[PDB]
Design an enzyme around this catalytic site. Structure first.
Site, short mmCIF file in Angstrom:
data_model
loop_
_atom_site.label_atom_id
_atom_site.label_comp_id
_atom_site.label_asym_id
_atom_site.label_seq_id
_atom_site.Cartn_x
_atom_site.Cartn_y
_atom_site.Cartn_z
N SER C 90 0.93 -1.13 0.00
CA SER C 90 0.00 0.00 0.00
C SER C 90 0.97 1.18 0.00
O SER C 90 1.43 1.61 1.05
CB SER C 90 -0.86 0.01 1.27
OG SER C 90 -1.78 -1.08 1.27
N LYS C 164 -6.43 2.64 -3.18
CA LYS C 164 -6.29 1.84 -1.96
C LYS C 164 -6.32 2.74 -0.72
O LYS C 164 -6.99 2.42 0.26
CB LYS C 164 -4.97 1.06 -1.99
CG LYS C 164 -4.61 0.38 -0.66
CD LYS C 164 -5.65 -0.66 -0.23
CE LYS C 164 -5.14 -1.45 0.98
NZ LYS C 164 -6.14 -2.42 1.52
N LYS C 233 -0.70 4.65 8.62
CA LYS C 233 0.18 4.97 7.49
C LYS C 233 -0.69 5.15 6.24
O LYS C 233 -0.47 6.07 5.45
CB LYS C 233 1.20 3.84 7.29
CG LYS C 233 2.09 3.99 6.05
CD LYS C 233 1.52 3.21 4.86
CE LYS C 233 1.46 1.71 5.16
NZ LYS C 233 0.82 0.95 4.05
N1 LIG Z 1 -2.36 -7.19 6.73
C1 LIG Z 1 -3.40 -6.82 5.94
O1 LIG Z 1 -4.54 -7.18 6.30
C2 LIG Z 1 -3.17 -6.04 4.71
C3 LIG Z 1 -1.92 -5.31 4.50
N2 LIG Z 1 -1.80 -4.58 3.26
C4 LIG Z 1 -0.54 -3.81 2.96
O2 LIG Z 1 0.47 -4.77 2.60
C5 LIG Z 1 1.77 -4.32 3.01
C6 LIG Z 1 2.43 -5.40 3.95
O3 LIG Z 1 1.51 -5.65 5.07
P1 LIG Z 1 1.64 -6.91 6.03
O4 LIG Z 1 1.96 -8.14 5.23
O5 LIG Z 1 0.60 -6.95 7.05
O6 LIG Z 1 3.03 -6.63 6.78
P2 LIG Z 1 3.91 -7.38 7.86
O7 LIG Z 1 4.41 -6.39 8.88
O8 LIG Z 1 3.23 -8.62 8.19
O9 LIG Z 1 5.14 -7.78 6.85
C7 LIG Z 1 6.02 -6.75 6.35
C8 LIG Z 1 7.00 -7.51 5.45
O10 LIG Z 1 7.91 -6.50 4.92
C9 LIG Z 1 9.23 -6.96 5.23
N3 LIG Z 1 10.13 -5.81 5.49
C10 LIG Z 1 10.01 -4.77 6.44
N4 LIG Z 1 11.01 -3.92 6.36
C11 LIG Z 1 11.82 -4.38 5.36
C12 LIG Z 1 13.04 -3.94 4.78
N5 LIG Z 1 13.63 -2.82 5.23
N6 LIG Z 1 13.61 -4.65 3.75
C13 LIG Z 1 13.01 -5.79 3.28
N7 LIG Z 1 11.85 -6.30 3.76
C14 LIG Z 1 11.30 -5.54 4.81
C15 LIG Z 1 9.15 -7.87 6.40
O11 LIG Z 1 10.33 -8.64 6.67
P3 LIG Z 1 10.57 -9.46 7.97
O12 LIG Z 1 9.83 -10.75 7.86
O13 LIG Z 1 12.03 -9.62 7.95
O14 LIG Z 1 10.10 -8.66 9.17
C16 LIG Z 1 7.88 -8.56 6.10
O15 LIG Z 1 8.08 -9.65 5.16
C17 LIG Z 1 1.54 -2.96 3.70
O16 LIG Z 1 1.81 -1.92 2.75
C18 LIG Z 1 0.10 -3.03 4.18
O17 LIG Z 1 -0.40 -1.73 4.48
C19 LIG Z 1 -2.85 -4.56 2.29
C20 LIG Z 1 -4.03 -5.26 2.52
C21 LIG Z 1 -4.17 -5.97 3.69
#
Ligand SMILES: NC(=O)C1=CN([C@@H]2O[C@H](COP(=O)(O)OP(=O)(O)OC[C@H]3O[C@@H](n4cnc5c(N)ncnc54)[C@H](OP(=O)(O)O)[C@@H]3O)[C@@H](O)[C@H]2O)C=CC1
Ligand SMILES: NC(=O)C1=CN([C@@H]2O[C@H](COP(=O)(O)OP(=O)(O)OC[C@H]3O[C@@H](n4cnc5c(N)ncnc54)[C@H](OP(=O)(O)O)[C@@H]3O)[C@@H](O)[C@H]2O)C=CC1
Ligand SMILES: NC(=O)C1=CN([C@@H]2O[C@H](COP(=O)(O)OP(=O)(O)OC[C@H]3O[C@@H](n4cnc5c(N)ncnc54)[C@H](OP(=O)(O)O)[C@@H]3O)[C@@H](O)[C@H]2O)C=CC1
Ligand SMILES: NC(=O)C1=CN([C@@H]2O[C@H](COP(=O)(O)OP(=O)(O)OC[C@H]3O[C@@H](n4cnc5c(N)ncnc54)[C@H](OP(=O)(O)O)[C@@H]3O)[C@@H](O)[C@H]2O)C=CC1
Lengths: 289, 289, 288, 288
Positions: C90, C164, C233
């Site tokens: 997002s 979104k 965010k």
């Molecule tokens: N959860 C939901 O219901 C929904 C979320 N979204 C959107 O999807 C996106 C992800 O959400 P969500 O899956 O819940 O997030 P999570 O916090 O569950 O996962 C975030 C992911 O990003 C990775 N990450 C964070 N920082 C870095 C970095 N500096 N370099 C590389 N990888 C990094 C993490 O790695 P690591 O495993 O190492 O921590 C992890 O795989 C967001 O933009 C959110 O707003 C959209 C619809 C629904």
């Protein structure tokens, strides 16, 4: 001979009744009677059972809300004499007060809403501003008895005084909170709160809030208890009732009631009204100073 | 005396540069040459092409926005000399200004944001209040050159001056609008706006808005033009940028920007800022007076 | 063709699982243990980041555009012409447009492809996708969205992220307003269960009252599926969309401020629906 | 058993039609021509106001509790013991409780029964009803609700009105917030059509975005079915419900104020959905 009486010796009532006591023979009563005994010893008033208050030519009340004013009016109802004036310095409700006035009129008692502004410092100094509501003849008659006041303005019939007071306090609330939001942001990015206020107080955004409340109580971290946050929220509620009259679009004032309620819920009704800014400090993770 | 230069001879800049001209050899520049020639003939300053402004020890700017300040900085860049000071009286954007400050520092030019309050009247009289942002030492160095000012306050590092200016106008906006909402309700229920203000201006809800704007411009229906509504909305925009720094909960100030935008769209950007209250009057079906 | 997924989080892990069952899938995650775990569970291949460049289509689902930019910069030296970058993050419209430009330097075509449907939708593979980018690229990527059901092309790069953000801003408002109202009803003796039974069969219904509040609030379960910090965010991005024209938007502007309050008091790691607990704390009663 | 209906308006007319199709029905309207028309169309019987007291169950669907009280006082001297009063008006909880006590003086049992489903729901006889009152009275009147489908007993007298008010406040907030968002998107080139296609398949969906905005706004049709003035009245009732505990409710409080603006500028007789036009006037663009 002369005789006046005061009911409700609280943060405001205690000093207000003191001014009355020094000028006229004054009978005082307080739910917690010890306060009346202390008042007698400090000002020369006479602590008496509630019923004796009906002996006075002018009865004064400064209670939390119109609810308590009603209670004591009902307790005194059977003893009230014809010709007596009731000066209510409570920050009351316009409508419920008009009804009380009609009720007291049954005993030949003339009710006048007379809420004040100036806080406890003003009460102690005897320079409170009074906004009177009621008959012109009655207003003229009571003026000489307002020993704790300086500026006295007749704003309309019964209820107009409380209405003006409520709106005044809603403006104070809004001015104060907005200044808090702004100062929080400024301090957060390295701006001096004191220097910012010196500029603001010399500019178009100045208010009593930025001039005499924030510098003295917030920047100093003193936060003295003079006006309960719960009572200001109660005032905002009355102001909302005034807005309900015409219900013209009033986005800012409506919200003001809600943010102060948040402060009340988190800080408690007995925190000082200015401590509402502490909620902004808590969220922001920084103090305004 | 040392040579100074003023860029931007608008409603504020023209008279401001006039005060400098009476004290120091002054070079002036304005996009429209006629204005500069006029200033030269009137005060004895010297109209010059932009590039010559680099001859000054102290460069002053009072332009519409930081965007225009950037444009002129860019054009002057190849000619700026070390040891020069840049006093920006523009109501700028804090962050954009800090970036500009760094680029100028690289040329040995010390930038200080120095927004002002007091309006054209203050500029004419030379009693403007200045809110300075920048290094302590630089501030000490420029104070002697602020001939158009009276009160000069150092509020913090670069960008702090612009932030305070924006927040001040945001507070003005809130205070003024809220007062409008409350007074509207009171007038609608039969309470004189004149009577209400008499009490309020002697009470805790008082502010510059209720004290010096509403009585003189609203009750009288005069509505003099001193600061365009469109410009206030712009300052509110800069204030929103200040709130974006930390983004701590700021419901009141955020809402303020939105209601003034409503006024700007319905009344037009050229209406006076105080005329924003006309929108409340329109919805209310009654004039605040 | 080969595809790759970067960011195996709450959404990414299951989303990549769907790709793995349809295409040879390469996966990478900062905390590599998740990629290894993903390989064992789905048959995908956990690989060093630079190997992601081997794919025809690269997928990302990270916290914000900032993290997407980071991984793109890391892959820059390896990216091959003709590759597609489908960003399920997002993200921010403008920054994403700049990223698209940076990637075009390597002949890589970026498309914002944020989703809606939550973790349950990701697991079921029924996510709604809002695509932003060239229509030729959209047509080429559609076949690869194995974790999606409803797919809509809403405009050029950045348009998907904007939609979104606005969608989530509406979710936030509906959710919070429902909270204020239910709290009031509960306080005067009307169970939230009965109230919702009516509301969900009336004009005031929304996805929030139908699928979030009954399941997470009335049950007191409050499962963690979407971080409150991330929703705030998203609201921030929505405010950026509102800043385009700055037409009067009192309700949406206020929404960001009250969710910020919730974030400050409950913490960014609380679930987004837990924002309603702030209302419960103030009200001194549970919404049940 | 005989029933009667007072208030043959946009909702009353069709509602009384469903009744007349199953029970001997007496009808009355201030503008009697409507009553005569109803008699000719459904077989009901137009009668002087006083004759309504002949029914076992009296139904009302007037503007506000004020009118219900006025009709009640007129009928008071004629009301019969054992009669039931089903009020489909979107009324005020407190005033309605006082009305119930007044009617009890004549042995008449009052029950608030506001509805949701609009004019289309009234015509189809699928209205959702939220009943407030005694359990025994609820059981007795249920069989007479010929114009309803979903019927929920939400509490004692006043609870039905409270739930309706809150339901409509949620509808109002959902609708306006959607307007603010769609307006911003349209201004940046995103079709409200495309945006809504995504939103209605996403977390931000609501009855407002699903069944009101596409059909009434995008088409520019703006049909008149529910007065903006009545929605503002409902919001005012919602505020009264909020005044019970006065827990922080910034969003719903602001909702009453913006719809009031719409009423002042568009007039109380515009359709409730036309409120979004205020946003279009400010924005300088149509939501399409
Ligand atoms: N959860 C939901 O219901 C929904 C979320 N979204 C959107 O999807 C996106 C992800 O959400 P969500 O899956 O819940 O997030 P999570 O916090 O569950 O996962 C975030 C992911 O990003 C990775 N990450 C964070 N920082 C870095 C970095 N500096 N370099 C590389 N990888 C990094 C993490 O790695 P690591 O495993 O190492 O921590 C992890 O795989 C967001 O933009 C959110 O707003 C959209 C619809 C629904
Ligand atoms: N503080 C300020 O700065 C200002 C306050 N006001 C208004 O003045 C009023 C009083 O404020 P403040 O003096 O601060 O209040 P306090 O809380 O200090 O005092 C309240 C007083 O009311 C009495 N009281 C409370 N309940 C009852 C009851 N049931 N029967 C009889 N007496 C009762 C108390 O008695 P006891 O001693 O037994 O507790 C006490 O004397 C309020 O309406 C407030 O909003 C107006 C301007 C300024
Ligand atoms: N007016 C007031 O009451 C107050 C204003 N201020 C601040 O002062 C600043 C200017 O206000 P004010 O003097 O009233 O403005 P005016 O509109 O009177 O003057 C603006 C000046 O900027 C110049 N200008 C406009 N566009 C450009 C450009 N593209 N490049 C170079 N110069 C340009 C104008 O030149 P030209 O003559 O060629 O058009 C003119 O000299 C603002 O930052 C404002 O917020 C602060 C306090 C009070
Ligand atoms: N429209 C909708 O979509 C929905 C409306 N509601 C609620 O239903 C109620 C009625 O709404 P709606 O049918 O649209 O209203 P309309 O304005 O269509 O009809 C109002 C009815 O009340 C009558 N009436 C008005 N004033 C008086 C009076 N002083 N004495 C006797 N009768 C009077 C009218 O009589 P006359 O014909 O003589 O003018 C008319 O029959 C409201 O409380 C509304 O909020 C609930 C759900 C949906």
């Amino acid at each position: 001979m002369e005789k006046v009486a005061f009911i409700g010796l609280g943060a405001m009532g205690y000093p207000m009744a003191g001014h009355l006591a020094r000028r006229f023979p004054t009978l005082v009563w307080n739910r917690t009677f010890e306060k009346a005994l202390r008042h007698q010893e400090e000002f020369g008033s006479e602590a008496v059972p509630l019923e004796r208050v009906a002996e006075a030519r002018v009865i004064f009340t400064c209670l939390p809300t119109t609810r308590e004013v009603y209670e004591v009016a009902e307790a005194l109802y059977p003893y009230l004499r014809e010709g007596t004036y009731w000066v209510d310095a409570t920050s009351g409700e316009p409508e419920a007060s008009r009804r009380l006035a009609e009720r007291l009129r049954e005993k030949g008692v003339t009710y006048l809403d007379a809420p004040v502004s100036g806080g406890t410092s003003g009460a102690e100094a005897g320079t409170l501003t009074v906004m009177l509501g009621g008959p012109e003849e009655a207003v003229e008659r009571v003026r000489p008895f307002l020993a704790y006041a300086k500026k006295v303005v007749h704003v309309g019939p019964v209820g107009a005084g409380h209405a003006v007071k409520a709106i005044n306090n809603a403006l104070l609330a809004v001015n104060l909170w907005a200044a808090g939001e702004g100062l929080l942001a400024l301090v957060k990015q390295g701006v001096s709160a004191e220097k910012a206020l010196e500029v603001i107080n010399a500019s178009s955004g100045r208010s009593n809030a930025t001039e005499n409340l924030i510098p003295q109580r917030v920047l100093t971290r003193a936060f003295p208890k003079t006006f309960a946050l719960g009572l200001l929220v109660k005032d905002l509620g009355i102001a909302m009732g005034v807005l309900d009259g015409e219900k013209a679009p009033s986005p800012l004032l409506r919200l003001a009631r809600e943010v102060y309620e948040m402060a009340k819920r988190e800080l408690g009704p007995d925190a000082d009204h200015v401590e509402a800014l502490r909620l902004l400090e808590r969220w922001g993770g920084v103090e305004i100073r």
